[PDB]
Each structure stands twice: as C-alpha cells, then as structure tokens.
Structure 1
Amino acid sequence: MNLMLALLTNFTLATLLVIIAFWLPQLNVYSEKTSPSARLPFSMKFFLVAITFLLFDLEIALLLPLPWASQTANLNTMLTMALFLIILLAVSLAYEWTQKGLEWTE
C-alpha cells in the first residue's frame, strides 16, 4: 500500500506543479502577440546506436541474475556460462567495432 501511496503522491504533486506552472502566468494577463510523418532526414547511424543499445540491453537482462547464480553448488558450470555470456557480449562489440559500426563519419 505504501509504495502505491508514494507513487501516487509523487506524480500527483508533479501534476499540480505542472498545471499551476501553466495557470499562474495567466494572472498577468499579458497582451496578445499576433506574430509567430516522414524521414527527418534521419541518419542510419542514429538508428544503429539505438538498436545496438537494445541488443546489448537484452544481453544485460541475462546477466542480472548473476548475484543469485553465484550461490549455486555447480559453481564450475555457473562460472563457465557467466563468462560465456560476457564474452559473447564482447564479441558483439568486436564485430561492430571492426565493421565500422561505431563510426560517425560520412
């Protein structure tokens, strides 16, 4: 219950601050002003950094249980598979690195 109350309170206050931040200036009654999809074009590089983040982020999901995994009796198996995951994460980086997937020059 407490966590729900905390989240409700935090986002309730944030909401009130936002609306009063938008209403309080209307007290001034400032004068009227009367004076002012598709590609972006998007670079492929900015798409590829986002995708690389995602795939690296998925591999991090598999590594999060490591603190618990170290409590097992089969430590040799656990350590072998833990290093296997991190190494494949390094191999993903090495492949990206050596095919110029990490460059910003056009």
Structure 2
Amino acid sequence: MFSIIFIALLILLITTIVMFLASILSKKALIDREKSSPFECGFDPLPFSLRFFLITIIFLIFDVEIALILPMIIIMKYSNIMIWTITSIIFILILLIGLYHEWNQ
C-alpha cells in the first residue's frame, strides 16, 4: 500500500506539473468583463430537488446493503453451509420483495 501512495502522489504531481506548464503555455490575452461571464446560450442570465435527493438516498441504502453482500464469497468455503444459504437466500429475497413492493407502491 506504501507503493500505492508513492505512485498516486507521483500521478498527482505529474498532472499538476503538466497543468502548470499548460497554464504557462496558454496564450495570455487581456481579461474582459464578458469573457469571464458564465455561459448561458446567447443572452446572459437552481432550487433544491427532492427527487434527486431520494435518488441519492436510495443509492446510499443500496450501497450499504451491497457492503454486506460483498463478504460472503470468501465465507462460503469457511462457514456452515445451511446458515450461509439461509442468510443469502433470505437477504436477496427480502431485497427483491422490498424492490417489488416499492415498485407497486
């Protein structure tokens, strides 16, 4: 993992050096009032959305749920088979029943 830190810091250093040299190599012109303006098509110029927030919340709940589906590949050769099967079938079946119930309602 210590080599991963060194190579990630080297990628970050190389990208910042490339962008700094690109900013030096960029052609410096006179800065303007209208050039700095945010682009709206043509003529010059959002509230909170709850639907996207519950999309993020559904993503979070399913992400923490996936983080419990993640370990059981390793445990299948090192656990009780009946307990592992009962928990896996119950886990994915309650997930499917909840998904279908939230679809129907």
| TM-score when normalising by structure 1 | 0.74
Aligned partners of 2:77, 2:63: CA distance in 1, in Å? Answer: 24
Q: Aligned partner of 1:8: which letter?
A: L
Partner of 2:64: 58
**Unpaired runs of at least 5, structure 2:** 38-45
Q: Aligned partner of 1:78: which letter?
A: W
Partner of 1:43: 49
State the Cα RMSD in Å: 1.8
**Unpaired runs of at least 5, structure 1:** 100-106
Aligned partners of 1:3, 1:46: CA distance in 2, in Å? Answer: 35
Partner of 1:31: 30
Identity of aligned residues (%): 31
How far 1:96 moved relative to its partner?
A: 2.2
Q: Deviations over 1:14-49 (max 9, x none)?
A: 222233333321xx331232334xxx3232211111
Partner of 2:14: 13
How far 1:61 moved relative to its partner?
A: 0.4
Aligned partners of 2:104, 2:23: CA distance in 1, in Å? Answer: 51
Alignment of 1:80-99 (within 5 A): 80-99=86-105
Residues 56 and 89 of structure 1 are in contact (CA less than 8 Å); yes or no, is this contact kept in structure 2? Answer: no
Q: Rate the CA distance shift 1:61–1:33 in 2: closer, same or farther, 3 A.
A: same
Aligned partners of 2:5, 2:52: CA distance in 1, in Å? Answer: 37
Residues 70 and 78 of structure 1 are in contact (CA less than 8 Å); yes or no, is this contact kept in structure 2? Answer: yes
Partner of 2:85: 79
Runs of 4+ in 1 over 4 A off after TM superposition: none
Q: Rate the CA distance shift 1:34–1:43 in 2: closer, same or farther, 3 A.
A: closer
Q: Aligned partner of 1:65: which letter?
A: P
Q: Aligned partner of 2:21: which letter?
A: I
Residues matched between the structures, number = 94
